[PDB]
């Protein structure tokens, strides 16, 4: 049948999840110097499934220097960079769904 | 056989669109064995095929309207 | 509603939710305009034929 859940696919939910993942990475970078803060991650496969049909801790590669902070700043930059690239792709896919949908209903 | 020719062309367009959406869903889900080039190639083929389908339909409909509006 | 909530500064509304919703209504309103146009053209064609 013709409906947005079948026309947009999962791209309507994927865009939202990656925005949340941006916040999770952003709050890790800010709390890099706060002692006692544990870096938290977001499981994309599980979060996407929850959104479609409806905050884990990252393990440190090395022991902390003593503050109690397990934020690896270079890992956060790499993860934020990849998340921003795939977020733009998600917008590209989801945006093209509407444009192709408009072309069909208008005929040109 | 002309009925077969029209359906085969539509089935080709529908097959391309399914392949395009399939790769986009796999890529967006985060599958490792999917390259962005294949996704972009697949969706560009789907766009060209659907553009052809619309234009051919418009030409046939315009041809139909010209004949029906002819004063006999 | 989502446009007004985001515009007035509510912190529980995301831009993606607004953009998905506003594009969702734009396609629907374009569809109902096209369907209305086709139906009126059909009515005009039927009524403008000699009987």
């Amino acid at each position: 049948a013709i409906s947005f859940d079948n026309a947009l696919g999962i791209h309507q939910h994927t865009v939202g999840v990656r925005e949340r993942n941006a916040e999770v990475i952003s709050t890790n970078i800010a709390q890099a110097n706060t002692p006692g803060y544990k870096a938290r991650g977001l499981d994309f496969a599980k979060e996407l499934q929850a959104a479609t049909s409806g905050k884990l801790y990252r393990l440190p590669t090395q022991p902390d220097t003593g503050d109690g902070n397990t934020v690896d700043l270079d890992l956060e930059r790499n993860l934020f960079m990849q998340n921003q690239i795939r977020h733009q792709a998600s917008l590209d896919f989801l945006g093209s769904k509407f444009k192709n949908l408009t072309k069909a209903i208008k005929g040109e | 056989d002309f009925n077969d020719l029209l359906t085969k062309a539509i089935n080709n367009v529908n097959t391309l669109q399914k392949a395009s959406g399939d790769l986009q869903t796999r890529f967006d889900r985060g599958d490792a064995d999917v390259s962005l080039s294949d996704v972009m190639i697949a969706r560009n083929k789907s766009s060209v095929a659907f553009d052809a389908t619309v234009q051919i339909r418009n030409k046939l409909v315009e041809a139909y309207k010209d004949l029906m509006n002819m004063p006999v | 509603d989502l446009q007004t909530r985001f515009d007035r500064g509510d912190a529980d509304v995301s831009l993606s939710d607004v953009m998905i919703a506003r594009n969702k209504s734009s396609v629907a309103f374009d569809a109902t305009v096209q369907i209305r146009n086709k139906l009126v053209e059909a009515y005009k064609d039927l009524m403008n034929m000699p009987v």
């Binding site: 013709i2 409906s3 079948n6 026309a7 192709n100 949908l101 072309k103 069909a104 209903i105 005929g107 | 539509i10 367009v13 529908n14 669109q17 399914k18 959406g21 659907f50 389908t53 619309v54 339909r57 409909v61 | 096209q34 369907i35 086709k38 139906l39 059909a42």
Partner: peptide, 17 residues
């Protein structure tokens, strides 16, 4: 097998013509 959403709209809009 099943026609895509874009093709279903195109067929339906064709029948209105």
């Amino acid at each position: 097998e099943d026609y895509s959403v874009t093709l279903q709209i195109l067929a339906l809009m064709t029948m209105l013509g």
